Paper text:
Mutations in [name], a receptor expressed by microglia in the brain, are associated with an increased risk of neurodegeneration, including Alzheimer's disease. [name] contains an immunoglobulin-like (Ig-like) domain followed by a flexible stalk region, a transmembrane domain, and a short cytoplasmic tail. The stalk region can be cleaved by ADAM10/17 proteases to generate a soluble [name] fragment (sTREM2), while the C-terminal intramembranous domain is further cleaved by gamma-secretase (Wunderlich et al., 2013). sTREM2 can be detected in cerebrospinal fluid (Wang et al., 2020) and is increased in patients with neuronal injury or CNS inflammatory diseases (Piccio et al., 2008; Rauchmann et al., 2019). The co-crystal structures of two of these antibody fragments, scFv-2 and scFv-4, have been solved in complex with [name], revealing interactions with epitopes distal to the putative ligand-binding site.
Numbering used by the authors:
A (entry chain B), C (entry chain A), E (entry chain A), G (entry chain B): 20 to 137
B (entry chain C), H (entry chain C): 3 to 123, 139 to 245
D (entry chain D), F (entry chain D): 3 to 123, 138 to 245
Write the structure that this text describes.
């Protein structure tokens, strides 16, 4: 059951992944792009190495990630959305060598219908 | 489960128009990019067009840019291809194909059965060799070279005689679901190889590579694998 | 100079207003909807009454506001974006009886082009 | 500086089709809702259609009965109105108009000059009172507008001088549009509204229309003609 | 194992209670005065009702408390230290109806040995 | 495990001086307030002095009239009491006692055994009622203690069996000291307080003293003798 | 007019320097030890290089510094006070090549009268 | 302004006791460390004792440790020195001296006038040379060496014939208030120099160094500057 987030090219898209803060307490989170049914889900960015600093924003290029471990909400920011950003992604909860899928996110990029010429 | 069925082909006079249709079932149609691939009789696969789930993004091969219009009806689960100013070189079997989630860096994982169209009377992909003779049990390697770097975004397809194409490898090295493990791929940048570790009787077919780094997902000319 | 934030109906829209965190130090922020060239810019929501707690999210209906006074970025969330949310808005910095415009924001609402029938 | 120029009007047979065009300049066309208003000869303003910057939202008056289609080309700063199965009641001057940022709760702040179309051989009712009023230069004048249901403060007032395109005076019930003389003011909330000219000037003899923008169909009142006593 | 904090009468006394910020994550803190070996440990002050705002200083008379849930250090301030403040106290971590002792603190008050007549 | 051992007592002439000592073991001597209590033959307990861990605070009963000096040596775990200009009323058994952590609002939880001193040839009044009480084994017994002014909950109860050092029963009005049988309990707040023995046991025939610790001078009540009916 | 802060050896001494937060807005702070009437006042520690991060604790050996630029209170922590820490110090407000004295602080170290042997 | 006045000296028999007093005015007495320095007839300065403002810290030279007790009354602004078991080697003029704020790394900036005591019948500091002959106008450099590193915590004092000592340099190189700028000091670790850039008639005197890195602020043996 995938969840679709739509954003316009050039805009910043914000993906939110709610989770049980008690079930996933003490686990860092990750955001990866799934290229096919058999993978890979290539790691894009993960939360801070120290779980106590999960609220600090981490960047990889135009993608950022921040975690609210109190309310149980993971937030992904796709800045300056491009057409090639479209595809399926995963919200992951990390423990040891394991990774639990929190949510499968489909990113749909909409063309910018506005002419910004002045 | 997943099904794609094309219709609307037939005989048409040069300069005339024609509208192809593709009915889809077994998946949430409005979440996937869709595309069209055609094959002239005795020639290789030629990528035609692709369209986004919102229809806001449409892509066209150079040979049909301006003449063709791709469109979709998500409520009807139907893909369309409007073809205008038809030339003799447009005679081909036209295939409907679904993309796995996304478009760039993706792959066509499900194909229709094709529909025949008869007109009455960027990155270059080169495969090597064009024809190869091998025996059952042989190890076979086929190469594909891109005119510029495509990173890892190369797909391999198989077409048995009389059948529609079928995806084998995506993203250079990932084995598609249900494909026998004797197939494998490798490479990055511009040089890529498809390997069949031990040839089987059903493997005698034609094999095509395809890049998906750009918006026009061009195919190689194909490699025919024939019996020695 | 209007900045255009485009969102899809039914989704949340995030509007970001960067500012000089030194020039606007100690100043609460506000978000108002400008109904015309001569006003009013009708106040919708503002940050916490205590500037020290500017990070706390404040709500007015489906509109939320949070302020990063360190990095200098004001964030407004429009929950469940609807066509009648379209229009011009202002990001404001408050000091006494004055208000400085941080950014004029045009909210444009796109219809959902996807058939979520599944 | 802002300019709207209509074209495409002319003579047409009943049952025929016609496509009006509107060229816009002097502003970022892609950022604004656009609309069409028409005026049958000797009748009041009738709101026709409106369209969003992305063309994703289109609105049509019910009296058209789905026969019209509004569209836009943002790359070419052009608005269009496709008219099908033209009838005798479609004979009118058709005005192009820009909305200030937004649509709901907004107002038509700039108008084209119109193009004549001659055909040859949610639903809130707006009623103005009175229909005609005789006044003298210097008089205090009040015009009332009543809505069939609550529209909060989202009422606009427009002036149309004889032989001229309409012009915005008041938006959001009480805000004086830029450039409009301060003798004009408006008030009201809910269903009852008033336009006031504190001291009548010679150029103020005209027809005045209210318009609600609470719903998606921005209907005008029937109009109030202000004539010389 | 009692920790001894010595202060001068008339000055403020700062008592620090370090703790495992991971083991006591999400737990409010308290400061109580132990009148004897069998109790009571009379509650004096506790941290903010919202754990998210544990950094906010809470007061009860001349006693203040603030909590660094990140570094894991609880701080209690005894304003205007007086001889009758001497005695044993507890730093506590609260969870539900339970309370874990973080540190047993002995407050010892020294007379001011300086003649501030000037 | 905790041990307090007094020394230095003996015979002394009126006007002379004497220095008592108290050796402590089994606890961190430097962390506790220490004090002295004396008992004239045939009379009740009289609180004498108290001293802080740093020696910076010293307290003296007014009846001494400044003639005594309390001191401590933390490195040697020893408490001292210097007695000058000894009088006949200074003849008493002198007890060493440790305070539980703190001083104000605290209690003397461990006692020495005393040393006899024989002299040869803020101000809250504590009154106990009754002075003597006859009871039987198994009886319910209540002893009352009244303070001249409010002392909140800071009242302690002590038991002294015949020929024994005093012993703490209740501190802070109602807290049962560790090791004390649960038949003892206390109550009260402000000025009125009660000690209760729910069911009298043979060893409970003794004298009972209250003590306030709200001020710096921890005066005892005059005592209540519990004798066999 | 010097202000005296007294602490016991082995304890942590906390020095507080209140100041006009408006008069010294945007100025970093410093703590130096004045060796004589003609100086030097040898710099020990200063607040964060970025004034917006003045609340972050800065360390130099056993001395720490943190600044409350909102309320106007500078806090110096002398951890594990030693006899050689006794002397005169300055609280300074820095602007360019200038340094304004906020407060002259005399640190008096008291001997530990308690024997901590167990 | 600042004034220190000693009293209590006199003649005493060996083994007897004696109590010196020092009255202070012109400064907040209870905020400063105080100390005692003595000088046997014909010998150099010998540091005796120092005491903290709270009296919680007292320091004693080895030759008087256990025999002397330093104390103070902050309410009376008075310093005391109790001397027991007096020996013949205790015969000296005893000086009262105030420390500038602190003790370690500090210096004795104000001195009393001394009081004579007559008994009837760590880090070593070495100065070089013991005696020096110079002329008015000469450049004079005096050296002081510590047996172990004292960082920059060296003070220089001047004693003119018949007068009490007087601080010149503290912390190796800082010129004390009111001292002529022809005096300067330098050095770090173990080697230090006092320099008089141009000798003046009043500069013919004896000069002592003193370390304040440890708790016992020992003096060098002194350098006598005499007329060539
Ligand atoms: C950033 O993401 C890409 C995939 O898009 C990944 O290959 C790369 O390693 C990432 N960078 C870091 C520093 O993790
Ligand atoms: C919330 O927004 C509405 C709409 O502008 C406004 O009328 C109302 O006063 C706002 N409420 C608060 C508490 O600011
Ligand atoms: C403050 O402390 C006193 C003394 O222990 C206590 O009685 C009171 O309940 C406390 N107040 C609060 C609000 O906790
Ligand atoms: C720390 O303080 C000392 C003075 O006590 C100073 O010499 C040193 O440079 C300081 N360190 C830093 C990193 O500033």
């Amino acid at each position: 059951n995938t969840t679709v987030f739509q954003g316009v090219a050039g805009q910043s898209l914000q993906v939110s992944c709610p989770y049980d803060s008690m079930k996933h307490w003490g686990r860092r989170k990750a955001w990866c792009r799934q290229l096919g049914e058999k993978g890979p889900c290539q790691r894009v960015v993960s939360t801070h190495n120290l779980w106590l600093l999960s609220f600090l924003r981490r960047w990889n290029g135009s993608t950022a990630i921040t975690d609210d471990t109190l309310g149980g909400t993971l937030t992904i920011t796709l800045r300056n959305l491009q057409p090639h950003d479209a595809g399926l992604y995963q919200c992951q909860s990390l423990h040891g060598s394991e990774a639990d899928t929190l949510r499968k996110v489909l990113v749909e990029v909409l063309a910018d219908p506005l002419d910004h010429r002045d | 489960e997943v099904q794609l069925l094309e219709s609307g082909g037939g005989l048409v006079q040069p300069g005339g128009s024609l509208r192809l249709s593709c009915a889809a079932s077994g998946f949430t149609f409005s979440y996937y990019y869709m595309g069209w691939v055609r094959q002239a009789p005795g020639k290789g696969l030629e990528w035609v067009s692709g369209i986004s789930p919102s229809s806001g993004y449409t892509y066209y091969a150079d040979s049909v840019k301006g003449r063709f219009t791709i469109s979709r009806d998500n409520s009807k689960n139907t893909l369309y291809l409007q073809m205008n100013s038809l030339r003799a070189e447009d005679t081909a079997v036209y295939y409907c194909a679904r993309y796995y989630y996304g478009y760039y860096y993706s792959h066509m994982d499900y194909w229709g059965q094709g529909t025949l169209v008869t007109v009455s009377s960027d990155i270059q992909m080169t495969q090597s060799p064009s024809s190869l003779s091998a025996s059952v049990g042989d190890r076979v390697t086929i190469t594909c070279r891109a005119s510029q770097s495509i990173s890892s975004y190369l797909n391999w397809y198989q077409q048995k005689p009389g059948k529609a194409p079928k995806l084998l490898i995506y993203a250079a090295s990932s084995l598609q679901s249900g494909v026998p493990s004797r197939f494998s791929g490798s490479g990055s940048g511009t040089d890529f190889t498809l390997t069949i570790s031990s040839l089987q009787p059903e493997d005698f077919a034609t094999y095509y590579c395809q890049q998906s780094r750009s918006g026009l997902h061009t195919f190689g000319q194909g490699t025919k694998l024939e019996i020695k």
